[PDB]
RNA sequence: AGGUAUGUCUAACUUCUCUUAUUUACAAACAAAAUCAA
């Protein structure tokens, strides 16, 4: 529907916007900012247009086009499980968790490793609560690297409510 | 740019039959030089308003009073110790006290004091609806139906005097019916039921009222609490001989009571109940009682909504003591009456809220007090006495019905070219055509030979002092001549072998006959026999062009080199010829001169070229000129009695119709009036008539023409027979009239009367023991494919019941080979019905049952058998009761409560073709109309109208515009694709347009982009439909295009194309109180400009007159006196909407009735043109608009 | 003179309270005085 514009000269005005893109498609609005602070164009706008039928099209015959004041002008088209682990040993690598997470769920990133207090703490990220029970009830108070880890939810208090199951079985489907 | 901007011309045709106030008094003097009596009646609905006479013991129209432009809501006489002028309360609060006057040659209504009074508008604490005054007539009370009372004292002197008002004021007790009790001049005491606004139960309690004179203020006397039930009080005047304490009558629903002011005596008397008592039977109660008192016999007529007619004296009850008693019988009864008067003749005036007002002579009076058998008495309160009514009418006797139509249903639009209107009666249940024509009998027609032209009439010379007279027919080839005798119409020299240009008779017994190659001079000889005594001929030969004649004067035109001037010899019998040559310098076409006196100055003649010139009769010279359009087919020259005004009416080819001015001593041609008639060349003919003794001019083409002028106004018309060839008045021994002789377009010689003529106050006639219809009509319908062919259905009241009773061309019709001419069908009500043809060739009807159920039947029409035979098809099963339906391409469209379906044909029973789910908006449809089958406007009983259009393939309506504001529609109709005629449940006459930003859209798009697909709205519509979604929903908006209100609540819209041949195309409405009256767009502009500056004029008028009338006093009449009621004009027609671009042509037509002084004194305004060009303008709507 | 054969040469990323005071304008066809047998 609305597309982004972009390296604009704030010579080109909103009129001159206008009959520029309803050679390619209806225009249903232009917002095109106008900075308060320089009274000037800050040289980007937003064309909504009647669908992203002819907003797409725009997209694509639009797209490296145009030439306006010698500058080209641009076009471009415009909630997870996170489980808290505490006392990691420093011989676990990211990917080495990668490799222990991924037979209990998929990952949506990659894991965080940080430091509290010299205690070495990682953020998981599961696609599905219930993986995450599976990562937590196995992995739960259990000895790696010659380390007992601690495997429960992060902070957001934390995780694991009764309208997160919900939500995020939802947000699953 | 064209501005759009349509311009109505509001005229109301026919004016408000439902009479809702009446009055005893007697006001004008008239046609007597000294004569005081009190029986006279004044009737008044809402603005309308008329005053009848009897005094013969029939009613008699007197005069129908100019438009008073308000909603009357309480009338009451006033007498004081004089003429008796009426007290008159209205909407703007303002009491106006008006007494009929005769000023110059006409009735009109005086005000002689408007007391200013809550505001304007119909309001619940406005001191109207509930008015009476002191019999003696000292005082007048106003109350609301809530919140106060306000009494004035009423005092005559050489100027009238209203004491300031007596105010009472009772926050939450809710008045009705005031009834005012007599007094022998003691003290003024009325009487009043009050019901509590704010309660927890229902109360209502009756209270008394006695105004002290003394102290000059209202005082609560005793408030007696009654059951609920309650439901009027009525006055009984004394008591005096029996044991100042008055008494009332408490009409309940079930029984009557009677109250003492004490409280000491309360009677009750248990109401009567009929024998049959028909299915639903209410706890009826008594609409209206009255009061009558003679020879110390006073009895009281009650009658209930069954309109059963009771009475009540009273008795002592000698045994026990003197003591008051209650006594009812039975009587006539009647229809219901919404009130009742009695003169003091014997003569009793039922004035029905239902349909028709009628007077009485009572003569058995009743049953004697002595019965007991069918009389009840107060002595057990508790009985019951069952009766069968009584259609025999014993006690009272019709004396005269006035034909009025006060709940109109619905109607069809018949005959359109003279604008007949077919519409029900609603009690006595027959067929009402009320028609702008002429009325026009047909009495003894004779079947003359083929091919006829004209006709003339001729006083028979041969038998003086005789009913005998000539009638001379024409044939192109033969000419025939006939003798006129009383019941005696017989057939006999003269030229039979050449065609008759002209006849006429000279001085006494003398006639001329002049024929296109020679003339015939006949005198009479004997009885039977003729002789010419001389004969003209062309000296070298020619064929006469034309001829026309005086009494005593002749005129002949031949080909073209020469005219003919003949006289007769005076003292003789004799013809002469002047030496002279009248070239004329053209061909003459025709010649006209005055044929009513001996000698006719200025002859008229016409030339082929087109123009018409003067002929001084010194002598002869050319005083004028007219070029006129195509060649005048034919020319009368005819001067009035009354005004001795000169007219020249010329008729033109190809059905233009003329008429001019002439002066006498100039010969001047002025104050052109034209007219449109039909297409054909026309005739014309002379006749006289009385309605005063009258004289017009027919007309013949494809209508007939009637051309007369009233009183300063003339009005040409339609007749009701479709055509007349040739037409001249006659006379009878057997009564005759206004009677004529004249021959059809068929070549067959016909008699007729016409009788009604449409004047301004009436422009129609109704073609319609006690009679009173159980069947109450329903609706009325019209085949599309058959032009005229009316289909009525009524209704039982009763067991559900209906029938459905066709006509077409003359009468009815009848049903197969029965002898009833109407069909019923048992069970089958009909809520709503429409007829529907699926087949070119089948016609199918549709009723839907209260039971909700579609039942289908079958039409036929036996055609020489003729009758009309109806077939139960199919049964179908309904969900809503279907309040509306019409018909859609091959199928039934019907709206639900809610949704729209569009019904096909199926077998066994109907299909539905497709379903259109309603936006949320509408709950309800009551009316919906369709545009080429393309568009439909869709109304509502809570919001307004909503525009759809039909998508072939998407099978489904989408509604593309909704309205602006919420109006409750109970009629709708299409002008034109873009725009939509509406009316209001609270009667207000609207047209909106779509706007021009959505006919380009639909105009360059189709439908079906409308619901899904790409239709590109600018950026505002959008913007409107995420920030107010619920207005905007439909995404347009109806700007209002023209707004109006018309009191009455609009049953009938109809378009029609034409009326009576005009150009305008009017729209026509028929109201549910009764009233018909048009909008007519104005072409061009000032037009609109003329009449929009008159009723600028007319609308301040009375305040023109009242600041004259201030300087004149500031140098040495009230601020109503012109209006006669407070209400401004744009206030009263804004009322609910400002009136938009509508200019009511109903107020401009009263500046016609005033004097010329007045006129004159308004138009002195304008720079623009004098006062008889405005009447000319004014005048000019009925004539050429319609 | 013609034909065939052979050789050689050359060309082709968005949707500025309170307080108590002071300063200054403004609104309301706001009201303008006297006389008093009011």
Redesign the pocket.
């Given at each position: 529907n609305?597309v982004?514009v972009?390296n604009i000269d704030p010579r080109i005005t909103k009129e001159q916007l206008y009959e520029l893109f309803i050679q390619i498609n209806p225009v249903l609005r232009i917002?095109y900012?106008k900075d308060k602070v320089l009274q000037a164009y800050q040289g980007?706008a937003?064309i909504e247009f009647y669908n992203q039928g002819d907003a797409q099209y725009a997209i694509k015959i639009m797209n490296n086009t145009v030439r306006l004041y010698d500058r080209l002008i641009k076009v471009?088209?415009?909630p997870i499980a996170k489980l808290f682990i505490k006392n990691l040993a420093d011989s676990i690598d990211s990917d080495q968790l990668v490799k222990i997470f991924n037979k209990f769920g998929k990952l949506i990133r990659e894991p965080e490793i940080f430091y509290l207090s010299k205690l070495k703490c990682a953020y998981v990220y599961f696609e599905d609560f219930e993986k995450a029970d599976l990562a937590i009830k196995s992995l739960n108070n259990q000895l790696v690297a010659n380390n007992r880890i601690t495997v429960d939810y992060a902070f957001k208090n934390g995780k694991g409510n009764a309208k997160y199951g919900d939500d995020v079985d939802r947000l699953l489907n | 740019a064209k501005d759009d901007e349509l311009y109505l011309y509001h005229l109301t045709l026919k004016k408000q039959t439902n009479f809702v106030h009446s009055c005893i008094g007697h006001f004008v003097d008239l046609e007597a030089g000294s004569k005081r009596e009190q029986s006279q009646l004044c009737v008044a609905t809402e603005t309308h308003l008329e005053l009848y006479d009897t005094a013969d013991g029939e009613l008699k129209l007197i005069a129908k009073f100019q438009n008073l432009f308000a909603t009357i809501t309480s009338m009451k006489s006033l007498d004081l110790p004089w003429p008796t002028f009426l007290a008159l309360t209205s909407d703007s609060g303002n009491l106006s006290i008006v007494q009929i006057i005769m000023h110059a040659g006409a009735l009109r209504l005086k005000t002689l004091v408007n007391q200013p009074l809550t505001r304007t508008t119909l309001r619940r604490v406005s001191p109207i609806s509930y008015m009476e005054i002191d019999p003696n007539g000292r005082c007048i009370i106003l109350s609301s139906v809530e919140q106060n009372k306000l009494c004035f004292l009423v005092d005559y002197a050489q100027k009238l005097r209203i004491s300031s008002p007596l105010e009472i004021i009772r926050p939450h007790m809710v008045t009705l019916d005031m009834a005012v009790v007599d007094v022998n001049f003691n003290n003024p005491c009325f009487v009043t039921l009050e019901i509590d606004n704010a309660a927890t139960q229902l109360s209502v309690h009756l209270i008394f009222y006695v105004l002290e004179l003394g102290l000059n203020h209202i005082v609560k006397k005793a408030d007696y609490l009654v059951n609920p039930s309650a439901n009027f009080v009525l006055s009984l005047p004394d008591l005096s001989r029996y044991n100042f304490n008055p008494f009332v009558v408490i009409g309940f629903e079930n029984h009557i009571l009677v109250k003492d002011m004490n409280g000491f005596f309360s009677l009750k008397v248990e109401i009567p109940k009929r024998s049959i008592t028909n299915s639903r039977h209410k706890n009826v109660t008594i609409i209206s009682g009255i009061v009558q008192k003679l020879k110390n016999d006073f009895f009281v007529l009650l009658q209930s909504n069954h309109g059963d007619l009771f009475k009540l004296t009273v008795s002592p009850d000698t045994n026990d003591r003197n003591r008051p008693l209650v006594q009812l019988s039975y009587f006539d009864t009647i229809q219901n009456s919404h009130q009742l008067h009695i003169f003091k003749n014997g003569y009793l005036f039922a004035l029905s809220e239902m349909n028709n007002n009628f007077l009485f002579q009572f003569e058995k009076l009743g049953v004697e007090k002595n019965d007991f058998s069918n009389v009840l008495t107060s002595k057990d309160p508790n009985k019951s006495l069952v009766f069968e009514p009584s259609i025999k009418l014993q006690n009272l006797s019709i004396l005269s019905q006035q034909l009025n139509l006060n709940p109109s249903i619905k109607s069809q639009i018949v005959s359109d070219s003279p604008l007949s209107i077919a519409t029900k009666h609603f009690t006595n249940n027959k067929i009402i055509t009320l028609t702008n024509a002429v009325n026009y009998s047909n009495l003894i027609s004779t079947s003359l030979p083929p091919n006829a032209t004209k006709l003339w009439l001729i006083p028979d010379p041969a038998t003086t002092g005789d009913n005998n007279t000539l009638l001379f027919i024409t044939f192109p080839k033969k000419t025939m001549i006939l003798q006129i005798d009383n019941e005696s119409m017989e057939e006999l020299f003269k030229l039979s072998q050449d065609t008759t240009i002209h006849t006429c008779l000279m001085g006494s017994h003398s006639i001329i006959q002049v024929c296109t190659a020679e003339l015939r001079h006949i005198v009479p000889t004997g009885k039977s026999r003729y002789s010419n005594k001389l004969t003209w001929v062309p000296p070298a030969g020619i064929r006469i062009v034309c001829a026309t004649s005086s009494k005593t004067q002749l005129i002949i035109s031949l080909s073209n080199y020469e005219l003919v001037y003949f006289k007769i010899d005076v003292s003789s019998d004799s013809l002469i010829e002047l030496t002279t040559h009248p070239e004329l310098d053209t061909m003459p076409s025709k010649v006209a001169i005055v044929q009513d006196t001996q000698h006719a100055d200025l002859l008229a003649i016409a030339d082929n070229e087109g123009m018409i010139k003067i002929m001084s009769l010194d002598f002869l010279t050319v005083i004028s000129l007219q070029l006129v359009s195509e060649k005048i087919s034919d020319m009368i020259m005819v001067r009035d009695s009354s005004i001795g005004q000169l007219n020249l009416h010329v008729g033109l080819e190809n059905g233009v119709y003329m008429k001019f001015h002439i002066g006498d001593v100039d010969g001047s041609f002025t104050d052109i009036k034209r007219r449109f008639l039909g297409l054909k060349p026309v005739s014309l003919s002379y006749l006289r008539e009385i309605s005063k003794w009258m004289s017009c001019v027919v007309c013949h083409s494809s209508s007939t023409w009637v051309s007369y002028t009233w009183k300063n106004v003339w009005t040409i018309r339609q007749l009701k027979d479709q055509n007349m060839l040739s037409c001249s008045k006659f006379v009878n021994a057997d009564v005759a009239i206004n009677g004529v002789c004249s021959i059809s377009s068929s070549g067959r010689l016909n008699i007729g009367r016409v009788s009604n003529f449409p004047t301004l106050d009436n422009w129609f006639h109704v073609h319609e023991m006690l009679q009173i219809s159980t069947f109450r009509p329903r609706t009325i319908l019209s085949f599309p494919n058959n032009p005229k062919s009316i289909l009525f259905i009524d209704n039982h009241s009763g067991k559900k019941q209906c029938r459905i009773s066709l006509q077409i061309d003359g009468e009815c019709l009848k049903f197969g080979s029965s002898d009833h001419l109407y069909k019923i069908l048992d069970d089958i009500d009909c809520v709503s019905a429409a007829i529907i043809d699926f087949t070119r060739q089948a016609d199918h009807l549709i009723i839907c049952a209260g039971d909700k159920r579609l039942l289908t039947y079958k039409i036929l029409v036996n055609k020489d058998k003729l009758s009309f035979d109806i077939e139960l098809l199919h049964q179908t099963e309904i969900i809503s009761p279907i309040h509306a339906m019409l018909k859609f391409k091959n199928f039934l469209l019907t709206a639900m409560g809610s949704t729209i379906v569009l019904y096909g044909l199926g077998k066994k029973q109907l299909l539905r073709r497709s379903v259109t789910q309603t936006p949320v908006s509408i709950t309800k449809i009551v009316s919906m109309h369709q545009w080429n089958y393309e568009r439909l406007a869709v109304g509502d009983i809570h919001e307004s109208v909503t525009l759809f259009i039909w998508d072939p393939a998407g099978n489904v309506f989408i509604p593309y515009v909704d309205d602006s504001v919420k109006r409750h529609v109970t009629v709708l109709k299409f002008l034109d694709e873009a725009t939509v005629i509406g009316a209001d449940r609270y009667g207000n006459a609207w047209t909106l347009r779509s706007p021009p930003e959505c006919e380009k859209i639909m105009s360059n798009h189709d439908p079906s982009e409308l619901s899904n697909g790409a239709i590109k709205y600018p950026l505002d519509v959008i913007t409107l439909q995420q920030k107010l979604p619920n207005t905007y929903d439909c995404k347009f908006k109806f700007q209002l295009l023209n707004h109006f209100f018309v009191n009455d609540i609009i049953t009938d819209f109809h378009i029609l194309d034409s009326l009576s041949n005009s150009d305008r195309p009017g729209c026509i409405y028929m109201g549910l109180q009764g009233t018909v009256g048009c909008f007519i767009p104005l072409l061009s502009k000032g037009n609109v400009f003329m009449m929009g500056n008159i009723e600028n004029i007319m609308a301040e008028a009375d305040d023109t007159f009242y600041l004259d009338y201030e300087s004149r006093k500031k140098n040495n009449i009230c601020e109503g006196s012109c209006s006669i009621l407070g209400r401004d004009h744009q206030e009263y027609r804004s009322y609910y909407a400002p009136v938009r671009k509508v200019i009511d042509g109903d107020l401009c037509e009263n500046f016609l009735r005033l004097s010329l002084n007045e006129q004159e004194f308004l138009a002195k305004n304008l720079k623009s043109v004098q006062v008889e060009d405005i009447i000319q303008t004014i005048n000019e709507v009925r004539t050429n608009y319609m």
């Open positions: 609305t982004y972009g917002k900012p980007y937003f471009r088209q415009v | -």
